[PDB]
Design a protein around this ligand. Structure first.
Ligand SMILES: O=C(O)CCC(=O)C(=O)O
Ligand SMILES: [Fe+2]
Length: 199
């Protein structure tokens, strides 16, 4: 299916309520904003970050910055619930030495999407990315190392954690338009946390 990927469905179910309270706390310092891609187009996914470094869009491309380009202040600290859940997920996946210094928080409104891309801004591509899904379900689509590779679909639901390691770490991926619906903890959206080793 996906070489190197360890899928832990509903792993973050118990931590969900606290993770959502902490997303709101992070958002009060560094608000969710729809980032502008280097070409001048606003993304449909709303983003923010927590930790020492944060994923951002810039004029010359994409980069990690210790400063929030909107607030001009540092990104909020990595919440304890975030650190604990990532550590437990990474350890269960065979990565006990994984220490993330960045967590990109994505918010998906109904219809929000993320087109095919590779995560290649990190210094060591051998280091995995821990993905945590919360709220409304979304269809995650992935291919291979090159753009013309056949697409495979995977539904990511509330509490689903995937540790993208090995070959899966380099796969082209995205999110199909979020279907409208209801979730008791997020109301009308989906949140996705992606823990990265960026320094
Ligand atoms: O929403 C997701 O599950 C994927 C997010 C993603 O690929 C990213 O922000 O780089
Ligand atoms: Fe990505």
């Amino acid at each position: 299916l996906a070489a190197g990927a360890v899928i832990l469905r509903r792993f973050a179910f118990n931590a969900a309520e606290q993770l959502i309270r902490d997303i709101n706390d992070v958002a009060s310092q560094s608000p969710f904003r729809q980032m502008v891609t280097p070409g001048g187009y606003t993304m449909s996914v709303a983003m923010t970050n927590c930790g020492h470094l944060g994923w951002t869009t810039h004029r010359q491309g994409y980069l990690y910055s210790p400063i929030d380009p909107q607030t001009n202040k540092p990104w909020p600290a990595m919440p304890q619930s975030f650190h604990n859940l990532c550590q437990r997920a990474a350890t269960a996946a065979g990565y006990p030495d994984f220490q993330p210094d960045a967590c990109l928080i994505n918010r998906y409104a109904p219809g929000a999407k993320l087109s095919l891309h590779q995560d290649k801004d990190e210094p060591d591509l051998r280091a995995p990315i821990v993905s945590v899904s919360l709220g409304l379900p979304a269809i995650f689509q992935f291919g291979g190392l090159k753009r013309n590779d056949p697409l495979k679909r995977l539904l990511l639901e509330h509490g689903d954690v995937v540790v993208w390691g090995g070959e899966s770490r380099l796969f082209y991926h995205g999110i199909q338009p979020l279907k409208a619906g209801f979730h008791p903890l997020t109301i009308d959206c989906r949140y996705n946390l992606t823990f990265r080793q960026a320094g």
